Curated annotation (Swiss-Prot):
<protein>
    <recommendedName>
        <fullName>Nuclease A</fullName>
    </recommendedName>
</protein>
<feature type="binding site">
    <location>
        <position position="35"/>
    </location>
    <ligand>
        <name>Ca(2+)</name>
    </ligand>
</feature>
<feature type="region of interest" description="Disordered">
    <location>
        <begin position="116"/>
        <end position="136"/>
    </location>
</feature>
<feature type="active site">
    <location>
        <position position="38"/>
    </location>
</feature>
<feature type="binding site">
    <location>
        <position position="16"/>
    </location>
    <ligand>
        <name>Ca(2+)</name>
    </ligand>
</feature>
<feature type="active site">
    <location>
        <position position="82"/>
    </location>
</feature>
<feature type="binding site">
    <location>
        <position position="36"/>
    </location>
    <ligand>
        <name>Ca(2+)</name>
    </ligand>
</feature>
<feature type="compositionally biased region" description="Basic and acidic residues">
    <location>
        <begin position="116"/>
        <end position="132"/>
    </location>
</feature>
<feature type="active site">
    <location>
        <position position="30"/>
    </location>
</feature>
Length: 136
């Protein structure tokens, strides 16, 4: 069973990356199971819907009363030292919110970190059907 722990925002970096204070330390978190268009791409730098995905994540986390992080059942850090988590703003999953608005695709999934994969894919299927943003 997954559980939520509190965290405090330090800074939103991108649509899918955030700096948070977690168990008293600054740490970078990457949102599990989602890919957002980048504003900080090695190669291309700024891609389409990049600034929109980024502003949507930032507003959601900046205006929340409570942020929580939920680790999955697999590895909790990627090879860059970023935490791999589902982030919740006032009880609403930010990973899902993005996918539901057509501002993120469901990523390539690495078992065992795939607990919310079906739920995310259902939201993605709805944003495609509605032709939102990325899907327009």
């Amino acid at each position: 069973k997954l559980h939520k722990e509190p965290a405090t925002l330090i800074k939103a970096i991108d649509g899918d990356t955030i700096k948070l204070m977690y168990k008293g330390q600054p740490m970078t978190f990457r949102l599990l199971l989602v890919d957002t268009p980048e504003t900080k791409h090695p190669k291309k730098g700024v891609e389409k819907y990049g600034p929109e995905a980024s502003a949507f994540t930032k507003k959601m986390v900046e205006n929340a009363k409570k942020l929580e992080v939920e680790f999955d059942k697999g590895q909790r850090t990627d090879k860059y030292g970023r935490g791999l988590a589902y982030i919740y703003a006032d009880g609403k999953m930010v990973n899902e919110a993005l996918v539901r608005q057509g501002l993120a695709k469901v990523a390539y999934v690495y078992k065992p970190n795939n607990t919310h994969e079906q739920h995310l894919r259902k939201s993605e299927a709805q944003a495609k059907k509605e032709k939102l943003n990325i899907w327009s």
